[PDB]
Every structure is written in C-alpha cells, then in structure tokens.
Amino acid sequence: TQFEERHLKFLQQLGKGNFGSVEMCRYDPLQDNTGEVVAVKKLQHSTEEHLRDFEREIEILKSLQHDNIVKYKGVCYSRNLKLIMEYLPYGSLRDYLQKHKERIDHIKLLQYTSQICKGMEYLGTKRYIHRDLATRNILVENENRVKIGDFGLTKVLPQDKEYYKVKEPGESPIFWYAPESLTESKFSVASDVWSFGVVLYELFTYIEKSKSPPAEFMRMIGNDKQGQMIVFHLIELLKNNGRLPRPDGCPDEIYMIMTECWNNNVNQRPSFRDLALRVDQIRDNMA
C-alpha cells in the first residue's frame, strides 16, 4: 500500500541481529492515533550485498500467502529500505513458550508443530529453502496460532537442482544445521526437515536454558573446544550418530519424529506432509 517514512512512528525495539533489526511502529498518516501498529525490519548496517539480499527476502515474503506465514504489508524507502509486516502481539514462540511453560501442554505444542509443518510445506511448494528454522523465528498471533516470522536466509532452489550451496560469511546457526549443511554447505527441503526436528526438540524442552541445542551439543563436544574446532567436532559427533537427548517428559513417539528428521541420509528424512500427518495422528490420539 506504500508507506511514507514521515508517518511511521517508532514505539519500541522488538529484536536485534547481526544484519537485521525489527521495530514496533505505528503507521499514523492522519496523526489522530487511529493508525495500525506494524513490525518494521531494517538492515542494521546497509551494504550492497545485504541490500540485494534484503530485496530478494522482501520478494520472497511478498510471494507468500498462508495462515502460518507472517503477512507482508509493504516497503518504506528514503535507499534506506524497510520491510513492513503485520504486528504479532505475543512475539517469538521461543520467548512465549518460557512465559507460559505451566499453561502450554504437549497437545498445544503439537498444535504449534502442526502449523509449522503446514507453513514449511507451503514453502516447499514454492521451492523456497528456509535455512533458519528455530523457535526464535516463529511468531505467536494468539494462543491457537503461530506463524513463520522471518525469511532472512531463505533461498530459492535452482530449477534443475534439489539443493542449494551457500556459505554466508559470519555466524551460522550450526546447532540447527544438517550434517551436509555443515560439511558441504548444501541446503535443501531435507536440511529444513533436520532443522524442524531441532524446532520440535526446542518445544519439548520448553526452552530450558541448560537444555538448549548449543548447550547440549557443547556439553557433548566439550566446553574446552573453541573456534573452528566446534564445527569440526560437531561434524564428527553427528557422523558418529551423536544426537540431542530426549527432552524431559517427551513421549517416545514425539522423540521418534525428532530422530527421523535427524537422519544422516538426506533421502531417508520424512517429508513435511508426512510429518504433519504423524503430528496430527498423535494429536487426535491424545484428544
């Protein structure tokens, strides 16, 4: 609908990142405070590589229309490009799950899981590879709806290939990465499935600080290991079928879903459509 910088009133900071930054604003063109509250994503330090990446990210979100995918509202130019999205009042599923640990049961976690699978299958249909599935990137609309909230690392597959090779300079979410993503930089629907199992793990730990994928893996590798060595030993751990433990209270049938996503053989990993059916079958049994 095109947003004018002069009417985007800053309210607060919703989140930070190395390349991104998200603010809570009020788009009030009438200056009568009847304007809608929106989320604004801006580049922390704008370069030409980050800018071109951001324009590719804006087109990715503009092209996505799904109930479990954050709504795109528009852009805000000067040059200093800003992505306008809908405001989701409850924030990340990461922070929400901690605050309502006591209030969110396994049945409800499976509702969220199911929704994540639906949104992820929608992405696959468009040949988009998320490359950063983590509960931190899932946003809460209300108690009964979560949406995939960021697409900063999302890449479109080549027409001819089923993977995409990319080595982005800087810090990667290595503890959510499939082995082939760590060793060969190959990103596919199957590496997204691996990362999904880490999301499902995250949920069932209720984001307990000590139980996080980095903390659990660093414990397995050794807290003495530093720098480029962490990636090396993680590769070796995953190769020797070293895996995240079953979260406390997690039923064996949910942990099985996790371990199946964490297959070293890319081809024997489940599909998002099969993951959805299983999660829904388990939900229906619990109900």
Ligand SMILES: NC(=O)c1cc(-c2ccc(Cl)c(Cl)c2)cc2c1[nH]c1ccc(C(=O)N3CCOCC3)cc12
């Ligand atoms: N689209 C959105 O509405 C939205 C988007 C992001 C986001 C997306 C991508 C990236 Cl890369 C980042 Cl960093 C952030 C974060 C939040 C969104 N709504 C929120 C409501 C509340 C909070 C929150 O926890 N707060 C702020 C209020 O005080 C308590 C602590 C955070 C968010």
